[PDB]
Amino acid sequence: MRECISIHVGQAGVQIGNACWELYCLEHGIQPDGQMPSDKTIGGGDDSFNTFFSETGAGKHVPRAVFVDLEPTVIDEVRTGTYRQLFHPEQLITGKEDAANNYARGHYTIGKEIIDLVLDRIRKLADQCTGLQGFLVFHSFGGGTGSGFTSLLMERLSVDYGKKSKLEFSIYPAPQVSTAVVEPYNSILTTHTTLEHSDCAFMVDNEAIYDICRRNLDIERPTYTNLNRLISQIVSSITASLRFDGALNVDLTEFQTNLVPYPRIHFPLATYAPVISAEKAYHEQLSVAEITNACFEPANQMVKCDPRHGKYMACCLLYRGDVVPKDVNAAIATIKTKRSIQFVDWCPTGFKVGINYQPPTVVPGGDLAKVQRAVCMLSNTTAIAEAWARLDHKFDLMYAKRAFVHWYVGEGMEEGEFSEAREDMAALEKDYEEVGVD
Amino acid sequence: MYTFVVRDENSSVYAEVSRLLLATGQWKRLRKDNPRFNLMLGERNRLPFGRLGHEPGLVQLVNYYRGADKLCRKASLVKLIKTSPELSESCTWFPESYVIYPTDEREVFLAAYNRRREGREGNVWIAKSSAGAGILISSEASELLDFIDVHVIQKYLEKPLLLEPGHRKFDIRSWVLVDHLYNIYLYREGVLRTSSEPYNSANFQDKTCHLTNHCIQKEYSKNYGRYEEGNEMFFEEFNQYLMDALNTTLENSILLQIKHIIRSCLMCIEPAISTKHLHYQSFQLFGFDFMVDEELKVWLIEVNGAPACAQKLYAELCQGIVDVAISSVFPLASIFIKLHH
Amino acid sequence: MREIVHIQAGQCGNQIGAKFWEVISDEHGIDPTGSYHGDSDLQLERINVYYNEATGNKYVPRAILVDLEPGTMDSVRSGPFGQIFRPDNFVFGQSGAGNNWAKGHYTEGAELVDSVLDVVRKESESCDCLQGFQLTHSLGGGTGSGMGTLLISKIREEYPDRIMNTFSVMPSPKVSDTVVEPYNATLSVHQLVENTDETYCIDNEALYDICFRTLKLTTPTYGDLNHLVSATMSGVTTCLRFPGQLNADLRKLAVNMVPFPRLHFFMPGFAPLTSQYRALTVPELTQQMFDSKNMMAACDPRHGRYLTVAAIFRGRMSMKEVDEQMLNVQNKNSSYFVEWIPNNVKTAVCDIPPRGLKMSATFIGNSTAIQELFKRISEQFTAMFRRKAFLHWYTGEGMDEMEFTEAESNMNDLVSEYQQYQD
Amino acid sequence: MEVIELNKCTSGQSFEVILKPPSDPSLEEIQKKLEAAEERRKYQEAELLKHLAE
Ligand SMILES: Nc1nc2c(ncn2[C@@H]2O[C@H](COP(=O)(O)OP(=O)(O)OP(=O)(O)O)[C@@H](O)[C@H]2O)c(=O)[nH]1
Ligand SMILES: Nc1ncnc2c1ncn2[C@@H]1O[C@H](COP(=O)(O)OP(=O)(O)CP(=O)(O)O)[C@@H](O)[C@H]1O
Ligand SMILES: Nc1nc2c(ncn2[C@@H]2O[C@H](COP(=O)(O)OP(=O)(O)O)[C@@H](O)[C@H]2O)c(=O)[nH]1
Ligand SMILES: [Ca+2]
Ligand SMILES: [Ca+2]
Numbered sequence A: 001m002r003e004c005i006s007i008h009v010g011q012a013g014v015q016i017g018n019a020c021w022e023l024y025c026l027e028h029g030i031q032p033d034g035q036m037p038s039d040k041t042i043g044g045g046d047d048s049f050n051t052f053f054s055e056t057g058a059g060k061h062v063p064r065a066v067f068v069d070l071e072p073t074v075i076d077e078v079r080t081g082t083y084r085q086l087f088h089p090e091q092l093i094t095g096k097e098d099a100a101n102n103y104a105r106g107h108y109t110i111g112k113e114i115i116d117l118v119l120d121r122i123r124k125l126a127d128q129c130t131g132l133q134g135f136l137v138f139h140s141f142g143g144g145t146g147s148g149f150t151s152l153l154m155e156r157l158s159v160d161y162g163k164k165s166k167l168e169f170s171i172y173p174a175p176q177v178s179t180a181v182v183e184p185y186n187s188i189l190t191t192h193t194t195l196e197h198s199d200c201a202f203m204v205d206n207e208a209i210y211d212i213c214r215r216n217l218d219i220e221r222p223t224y225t226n227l228n229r230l231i232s233q234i235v236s237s238i239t240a241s242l243r244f245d246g247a248l249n250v251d252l253t254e255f256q257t258n259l260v261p262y263p264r265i266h267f268p269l270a271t272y273a274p275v276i277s278a279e280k281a282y283h284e285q286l287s288v289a290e291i292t293n294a295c296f297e298p299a300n301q302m303v304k305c306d307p308r309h310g311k312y313m314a315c316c317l318l319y320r321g322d323v324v325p326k327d328v329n330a331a332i333a334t335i336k337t338k339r340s341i342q343f344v345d346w347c348p349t350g351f352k353v354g355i356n357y358q359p360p361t362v363v364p365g366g367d368l369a370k371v372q373r374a375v376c377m378l379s380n381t382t383a384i385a386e387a388w389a390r391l392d393h394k395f396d397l398m399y400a401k402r403a404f405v406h407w408y409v410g411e412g413m414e415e416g417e418f419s420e421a422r423e424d425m426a427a428l429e430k431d432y433e434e435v436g437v438d
Numbered sequence B: 001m002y003t004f005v006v007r008d009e010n011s012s013v014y015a016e017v018s019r020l021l022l023a024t025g026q027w028k029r030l031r032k033d034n035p036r037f038n039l040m041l042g043e044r045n046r047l048p049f050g051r052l053g054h055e056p057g058l059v060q061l062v063n064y065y066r067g068a069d070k071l072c073r074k075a076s077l078v079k080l081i082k083t084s085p086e087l088s089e090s091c092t093w094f095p096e097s098y099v100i101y102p103t104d105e106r107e108v109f110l111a112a113y114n115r116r117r118e119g120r121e122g123n124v125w126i127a128k129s130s131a132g133a134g135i136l137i138s139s140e141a142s143e144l145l146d147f148i149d150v151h152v153i154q155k156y157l158e159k160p161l162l163l164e165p166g167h168r169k170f171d172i173r174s175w176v177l178v179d180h181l182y183n184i185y186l187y188r189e190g191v192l193r194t195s196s197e198p199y200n201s202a203n204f205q206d207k208t209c210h211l212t213n214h215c216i217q218k219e220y221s222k223n224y225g226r227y228e229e230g231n232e233m234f235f236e237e238f239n240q241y242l243m244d245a246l247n248t249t250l251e252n253s254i255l256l257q258i259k260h261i262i263r264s265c266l267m268c269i270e271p272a273i274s275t276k277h278l279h280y281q282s283f284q285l286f287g288f289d290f291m292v293d294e295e296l297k298v299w300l301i302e303v304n305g306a307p308a309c310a311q312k313l314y315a316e317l318c319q320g321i322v323d324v325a326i327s328s329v330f331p332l333a334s335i336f337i338k339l340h341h
Numbered sequence C: 001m002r003e004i005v006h007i008q009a010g011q012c013g014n015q016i017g018a019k020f021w022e023v024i025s026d027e028h029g030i031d032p033t034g035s036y037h038g039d040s041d042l043q044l045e046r047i048n049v050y051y052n053e054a055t056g057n058k059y060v061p062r063a064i065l066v067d068l069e070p071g072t073m074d075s076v077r078s079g080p081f082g083q084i085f086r087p088d089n090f091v092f093g094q095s096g097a098g099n100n101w102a103k104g105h106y107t108e109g110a111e112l113v114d115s116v117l118d119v120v121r122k123e124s125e126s127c128d129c130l131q132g133f134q135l136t137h138s139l140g141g142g143t144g145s146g147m148g149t150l151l152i153s154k155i156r157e158e159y160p161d162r163i164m165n166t167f168s169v170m171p172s173p174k175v176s177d178t179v180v181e182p183y184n185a186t187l188s189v190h191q192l193v194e195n196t197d198e199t200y201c202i203d204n205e206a207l208y209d210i211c212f213r214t215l216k217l218t219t220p221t222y223g224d225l226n227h228l229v230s231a232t233m234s235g236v237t238t239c240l241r242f243p244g245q246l247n248a249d250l251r252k253l254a255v256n257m258v259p260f261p262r263l264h265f266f267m268p269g270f271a272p273l274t275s276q277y278r279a280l281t282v283p284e285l286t287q288q289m290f291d292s293k294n295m296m297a298a299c300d301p302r303h304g305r306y307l308t309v310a311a312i313f314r315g316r317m318s319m320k321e322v323d324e325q326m327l328n329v330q331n332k333n334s335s336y337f338v339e340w341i342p343n344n345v346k347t348a349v350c351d352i353p354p355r356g357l358k359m360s361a362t363f364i365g366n367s368t369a370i371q372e373l374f375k376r377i378s379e380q381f382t383a384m385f386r387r388k389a390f391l392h393w394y395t396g397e398g399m400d401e402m403e404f405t406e407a408e409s410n411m412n413d414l415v416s417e418y419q420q421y422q423d
Numbered sequence D: 001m002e003v004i005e006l007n008k009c010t011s012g013q014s015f016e017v018i019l020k021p022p023s024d025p026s027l028e029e030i031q032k033k034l035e036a037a038e039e040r041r042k043y044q045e046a047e048l049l050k051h052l053a054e
């Protein structure tokens, strides 16, 4: 058993982290007070769920998590929330004034004053690990803390834990819920300084989650709570293999081995199905083929894009519920004939499948209905580069006029880092087009 | 009130569509780089499909099908016909073609060339590329390959149907519109682009009687416009000719095969380019070019993704584009034949 | 606990500032004696941004009242909510400023500024997380204009890393006290260009037109003008006084609204403006909110372009329909929004409506058309300065004509800067 | 289709399906950049204070 440490940075990362750890407890049967009746080994053990939870002598299961925000209002709610008993004060780190949606403020000005405290609190949890795999870092692209302080943390983590893996759960900016005009700036700045330090990143475009909520959940004006509950489901599907018995993606190293043959191209596309509104009593339970077919519908992807006009480098299928291998292969055969699935020549055309019999857990009272079976597809397709193009275009529009640049220069950041980060994104877009186009 | 942008100033078809939309008093043209548009008349090269369908509160529609180049390229079309089971290597309405680079099919093209050599059958082939006006019509393979040094070589229809009087060649251009729902609409009005020079099967060096191109006929042919205005014979005249000359109609002898070929091609790539469940919608106007042999058999030559219309038909066709392709998505305040499938 | 320190200087500054505290005090349930008597916890969740909590559960406004004459400030202390202000925070002289920027900035004001800074320092020292300052004042007089800008300069020197926000009333010959107002306004505008992060340009010309044309007030008084400013100030600060995600503090507001450091002068708008029990639909709020007749700057937005826009809807309404109508305005008139700043229109919603309205909308626009306001002042300034008319009032206080020439050039530069981004 | 590496346990199973065969900066350097940025801030502030002193 090797432990994993979760790091939640900024408002988005903290609230999403709060939703995931709530879901984890419901899945592992951990009550809000940290008690786990089904756990018979009191005060310790090396079970699969111990990769995310430690055990006190009193039998409390404490998440191996750290929450960091440059302002206290968001982490304060975790201090007084339903699962307040899970965490101890050392796990929650807050400042006074946030980064004001300014990457330079979170990275240079304010981040420099708290980076050593966070690293010290992370060293605490690391000292309790017999074999640390690495870290899972949650944060947004657009926020000043999520973008600015995260890249400084990823830089240092590579210094202190050079041999450890690091995976991201990143929130792509969407105007329908964004709060700052400069979020394209922060997105490209943080992607530039974090690229070398991240082994695998799962981008979640708020636009996609927003529309899925309106379309499939009948939420007219979805909220962060609606978005985060749906996101935590996706995250749970991706981390389930690290928390349950199994043979697929059993450690963080396997994520990079199965999904990232090209290091820079480490942004797998996530697709989830089914998303059913709990506000309807009866809904025809979808089959293995139907939900598998849905994994190739853009309407269900975490980032709107067209995988047909790209090439695949790897594809995993994570099933939860009543699913046997026979039905998966039968569904793949049908889909393979109808769908346009093109792998790169230097990669085998195949699917790594993982099945966990315990069906998905839904937060009691939430919007997602219980289902007999669900699937999350992790496919590394060049089509995800469409998101980089959109971001890079808006960046070019504002930076041509130097709009808002003075806010970053005023925090000590040099104007040259803007074009440096943009050229890096320009190279990234070039890599994708080389792999997935002719 | 709808909005649209124009990103192809050299589009004669959509320059008229733009004029029609404005004349409706219900469409407003924006700057070419303004993202808050309902309709984009996009450019031909590197149209940014990745930036479409991300404007909250805007139903966005574009006048091109992403991935339709597989059908509108010489080498792409050949590769798509040989490697697609729906069309198959046994495709009976597409001339035997091969792709040759200056993968490659040099050894395959010569294999069938030697088989026809011994067979003493017509061994005249034509080599062309997607960067032409330049083509070479030769009956010796050695001259074709030396000329290319991407290109594609296919069998040259040695026995084409010849109009009379004139003993001349021609080709049939069909305009086909595909809307966001993937309805296939074949414009009722076609055009025959005829060669005003008598077809001479002895010498292929003089390409005035072999190439029916409107530009090549107006520059290298002395009888341009002698038989019909602008070397363009519309369906009404062509139909009457087939009745007087061959005792048949244009619908029975030719138009059935054309409608069949149009369905097969567009139905084949439908899974790859359909925008049914996509965050933006697409439609596109296509230009199919057919050859009719002496036995009243129709052959597909190529499909143009950015075609221009005939002068007399610009008005009717462009108005039809607005009706079924644009107004069907953005309603305001038939000249097509629906090829069902 | 992001505290804001409020400052009101001069006649106009204190009369408008007094109404502001009267309006927001009612919105937060605070009574003239500082006691809370509300029915919603949303009233107190951010009450500390503008109020200090005193002994006995009393809320004291974090406001400093400044003037060189005691007249107007005696009226405030005797007004409705006059007892609610901290007596130590009344800082005033006796000589006045005679509508003279020089007196407020160099002579009479210099003698009193240190006293004001001592009160500001006392207020800031007890702030858990000081956001910055907001100053109410006019630019046409002497105290608010001349001393107000002197205060801003000294506050920035002592608090360089804090946001400086002002509500600035621009003079207009339609509502004019003296002929030297263009002089005082031109000198102050340069101070604002350098030393503020956000300035809401409130034009007395617009306020009068609205009172006369829209509200149907034949003989508008300053009180009528201050009703508009009072309701506008409450609208523009909604996101600061109630829980929210967008533009919730002064710096995040500045980052969203100011793409270039010197172009931080905003046009505020308010809707509805009724002359009154009819219900206003969300589509109606949006159209009026963007209508020039509801703008407080007297600048035609269709003469320029929007760099950024901050919208605030108050009341119980369809947030879905709010998103729809907002997206409709941008998509219907996308030519008036600069295309090189994507998604420059941010919208917030607050459940608590203003007093007497089921729902309202406050508009905050950074438009290049604001140059019309500065051109207007610049023309009036030059009309007198080319003949050195009335300058002796200023040279008698130590000023030199060079300082006027420089202020003139600084103004025309600002006009040119707006013009370059409108093309 | 070829099914390989079938692993089974009480809580599930995994496998692979093949449809077709194929055809860092040191802490010192980081400290320099962080302090270099703080220096440009101090310089910009000193200039502002010099401006206000004039
Ligand atoms: N999906 C989702 N997105 C969020 C959530 N909270 C914020 N965001 C997005 O994150 C972006 C803003 O970044 P924040 O995380 O709020 O900012 P921050 O990390 O706290 O950094 P500061 O600027 O210092 O406040 C916006 O695009 C929001 O849409 C959330 O709870 N769920
Ligand atoms: N296999 C074949 N048999 C007989 N004639 C052929 C032929 N291939 C091409 N041609 C002749 O060549 C002419 C033009 O060829 P092609 O259409 O390939 O070039 P092009 O793309 O420049 C014209 P357009 O773009 O307007 O369709 C046609 O009019 C046709 O008569
Ligand atoms: N809106 C409004 N404007 C005012 C008021 N009082 C004065 N003004 C304007 O302010 C300018 C005079 O400045 P004033 O504040 O009286 O001078 P000060 O006391 O020395 O700062 C003139 O342009 C007036 O039009 C008021 O109560 N409301
Ligand atoms: Ca245990
Ligand atoms: Ca590393």
Ligand SMILES: [Ca+2]
Pocket: C111
């Ligand atoms: Ca004195």
Ligand SMILES: [Mg+2]
Pocket: A010, A011, A071, A098, A143, A145
């Ligand atoms: Mg934050």
Ligand SMILES: [Mg+2]
Pocket: B302, B304
């Ligand atoms: Mg062509």
Ligand SMILES: [Mg+2]
Pocket: C011, C012, C141, C177
């Ligand atoms: Mg006065």
